[PDB]
Amino acid sequence: DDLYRQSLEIISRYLREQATGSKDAAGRRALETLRRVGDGVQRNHETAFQGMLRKLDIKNEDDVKSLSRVMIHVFSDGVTNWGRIVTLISFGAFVAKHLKTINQESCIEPLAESITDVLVRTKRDWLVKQRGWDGFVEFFHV
Amino acid sequence: QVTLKESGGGLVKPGGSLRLSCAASGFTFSSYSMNWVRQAPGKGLEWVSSISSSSSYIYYADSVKGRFTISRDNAKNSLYLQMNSLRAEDTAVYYCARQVGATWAFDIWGQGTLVTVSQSVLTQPPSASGTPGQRVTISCSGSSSNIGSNTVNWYQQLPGTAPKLLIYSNNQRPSGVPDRFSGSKSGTSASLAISGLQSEDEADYYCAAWDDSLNAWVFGGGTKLTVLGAA
Ligand SMILES: Cc1nn(C)c(C)c1-c1cccc2c(CCCO[C@@H]3CCCc4ccccc43)c(C(=O)O)[nH]c12
């Protein structure tokens, strides 16, 4: 399953460097776009993001495992697009930053797995029609 | 100066082989999907193949599967068409075209190259006519898997010229297209409107959309628009 593995590698790498603050083919191009658009979405939606973060009340590892419920519940609500997919990964980065401050850095890798799982399981067909990560790069090109 | 320029066309015997090249200038080539589109002499547009930016997503029309191979070299800004087992039916002018990531419209087209070897899924009326100032409408009929699931694009083709993007995303006009031109979509049909005819409007018009069942681009058969009684 190339699509699950590829998506996990991109989401995990970006979530790691958003918490650490230290950066590290098709995947190479996708991370460049994700840094540019992701950090953009985080600024434009800080009021909504901090409001959701305080409502969730993430203090330990148990809370991180229960996030998959809310994830599926709100991500599946309406119609999907590249922007909503970017908001999913951007808020995922906004939570990973909170996990660094509360000394729960060990919960960054499983959160990235849970995010990839929801994305691929609910939207595989949409992602395939849209040309996967090649499509993601071409969509946000400026 | 954002341009595309085709090379390789020539006379070939049936069953022969020929290789096409397309050189891109003025843009980040590594960040765009690329297409081949052919036009038999005195006939309509026909999509051939497409390749994504990283070469991961490749598609072909049924009439070329197994004989034609699309490839790209981002380090040389080049797109290729490797054509084996060439048939009389393959005689056409082959166009190189750039596709927009956010819309799938073909915004930049090359001048074409003649390859000489020696029924469309979207229906349009074969002809349309009017007088200066008149409002004329051109229709485009498809089905659930194409127009019913995807956006419609329109292309203008002036006599002895390559096609150009007229309308994208059903009703959006690119920069340089007059507001006389407008579009609409309803169910599995679409329409092109010219509110106030001008003599430079005399041309051929084609619609196009992606098909989710065929995994292919389907073009309309075209409409020849004539401008009558001016001076
Ligand atoms: C509310 C709300 N109002 N507005 C105007 C906006 C921008 C938001 C908003 C706030 C936060 C997230 C989203 C998303 C993504 C959906 C998934 O999010 C889950 C829910 C929690 C657990 C969790 C943990 C890690 C990563 C993802 C998540 C969307 C969207 O799908 O459009 N909208 C969000």
**DSSP assignment of B182-224:** EEEEETTEEEEEEES--GGG-EEEEEEEEETTTTEEEEB--EE
Cα nearest neighbour of B211 on chain A: A129
Alpha-carbon distance of A87 to A83, in angstroms, equals 6
Dihedrals phi, psi of B74, to nearest 5 degrees:
-60, -30
Which residue in B31, B54, B99 is closest to A25 by CB distance? B54
Q: Which residue lies with its CA nearest to atom 20 of ligand 1? A: A71
- Is B57 part of the contact surface with chain A (CB cutoff 8 Å)? yes
Angle formed at CA A82 by CA B70 and CA B31, multiple of 5 degrees: 35
A 10 A CB-CB count for B194 gives 21
Residues 6+ apart with CB under 8 A from A40: none
Q: Side-chain half-sphere of B1: how many Cα atoms within 13 Å? A: 2
Q: CA-CA-CA-CA torsion for B44, B49, B53, B57, nearest 10 degrees?
A: 140
DSSP B24-76: EESS-GGGSEEEEEEE-TTS-EEEEEEE-TTS--EEE-TTTTTTEEEEEEGGG
Pocket-testing residue among A15, A37, A46, A52, ligand 1, by greatest number of atoms within 8 A of Cβ:
A52
For ligand 1, the distance from its centroid to the CA atom of residue A73, given in whole angstroms, is 10
Alpha-carbon distance of A122 to B81, in angstroms, equals 37
CATH number, domain of A119, equals 1.10.437.10
Separation in Å, CA of A119 to nearest CA in chain B: 20
Alpha-carbon distance of A56 to A108, in angstroms, equals 16
DSSP run (H or E) holding B3: strand B3-7
Q: CA-CA-CA-CA torsion for B169, B172, B175, B181, nearest 10 degrees?
A: 120
Dihedrals phi, psi of B176, to nearest 5 degrees:
105, -10
Alpha-carbon distance of B210 to B155, in angstroms, equals 15
Cα nearest neighbour of A32 on chain B: B31
The number of angstroms, rounded, from the C-alpha of B108 to the middle of its chain's C-alpha atoms is 10
Collapse the DSSP code of B105 into the 3-class scheme (helix H, G, I; strand E, B; otherwise coil) and give the result: coil
DSSP bridge partners of B51: B34, B58
Domain count, chain A: 1
Q: Are A119 and A7 a contacting pair, CB within 8 Å?
A: yes
DSSP bridge partners of B135: B195
CB contact under 8 A, A131 and B52: yes
CB A89 less than 6 A from any atom of ligand 1: no
CA-nearest of B125, B119, B111, B106 to B204 is: B125
Alpha-carbon distance of B91 to B83, in angstroms, equals 12
10 Å CB burial of residue B146 (0-12, 13-18, 19+) is buried
CA-nearest of B186, B180, B150 to B168 is: B150
Per-residue CA distances from B20 to A92, B33, B115 (Å)? 46, 17, 9
DSSP chain A: -HHHHHHHHHHHHHHHHHHH-----HHHHHHHHHHHHHHHHHHHTHHHHHHHHHHH---SHHHHHHHHHHHHHHHTSS---HHHHHHHHHHHHHHHHHHHHTT-GGGHHHHHHHHHHHHHHHHHHHHHHTTHHHHHHHHT--
Q: Which two tokens stand for residue B61?
A: 């029309």
Residues 6+ apart with CB under 8 A from B32: A138, A141, B53, B98, B99, B101
Place of tokens 């087209």: B109
Q: Are B207 and B192 a contacting pair, CB within 8 Å?
A: yes
Collapse the DSSP code of B90 into the 3-class scheme (helix H, G, I; strand E, B; otherwise coil) and give the result: helix
Alpha-carbon distance of B175 to B172, in angstroms, equals 10
Residue B187, phi-psi category: left (phi > 0), alpha (psi -120 to 50), beta (remainder): left
CB A48 less than 6 A from any atom of ligand 1: yes
Residue of B35, B54, B99, B146 to mutate, interface with A, max A Cβ within 10 Å: B54
Dihedrals phi, psi of A26, to nearest 5 degrees:
-75, -35
Which residue in A29, A133, A141 is closest to B101 by CB distance? A141
Question: Resolution of this PDB entry, in A?
Answer: 2.4
10 Å CB burial of residue B63 (0-12, 13-18, 19+) is middle
Is the C-alpha dihedral spanning B191, B197, B198, B204 positive or negative? positive
CB A94 less than 6 A from any atom of ligand 1: no
Alpha-carbon distance of B205 to B137, in angstroms, equals 11
Alpha-carbon distance of B100 to A11, in angstroms, equals 25
Collapse the DSSP code of B89 into the 3-class scheme (helix H, G, I; strand E, B; otherwise coil) and give the result: helix
Alpha-carbon distance of A127 to A6, in angstroms, equals 12
Is the C-alpha dihedral spanning A30, A32, A37, A41 positive or negative? positive
Residues 6+ apart with CB under 8 A from A71: A88, A114, A115, A118
Place of tokens 């409002």: B135
CA-nearest of B217, B197, B81, B91 to B155 is: B217
Alpha-carbon distance of B72 to B55, in angstroms, equals 7
CA-nearest of B30, B26, B206, B34 to B120 is: B206
Alpha-carbon distance of B29 to B202, in angstroms, equals 34
Alpha-carbon distance of A126 to A129, in angstroms, equals 5
CA-nearest of B99, B82, B167 to A131 is: B99
Angle formed at CA B22 by CA B18 and CA B24, multiple of 5 degrees: 170
Residues 6+ apart with CB under 8 A from B82: B17, B19, B20, B68, B69, B70, B71
- Is A129 part of the contact surface with chain B (CB cutoff 8 Å)? yes
A 10 A CB-CB count for A7 gives 25
Give the domain extent around A93. Answer: 1-140
CB contact under 8 A, A137 and B31: yes
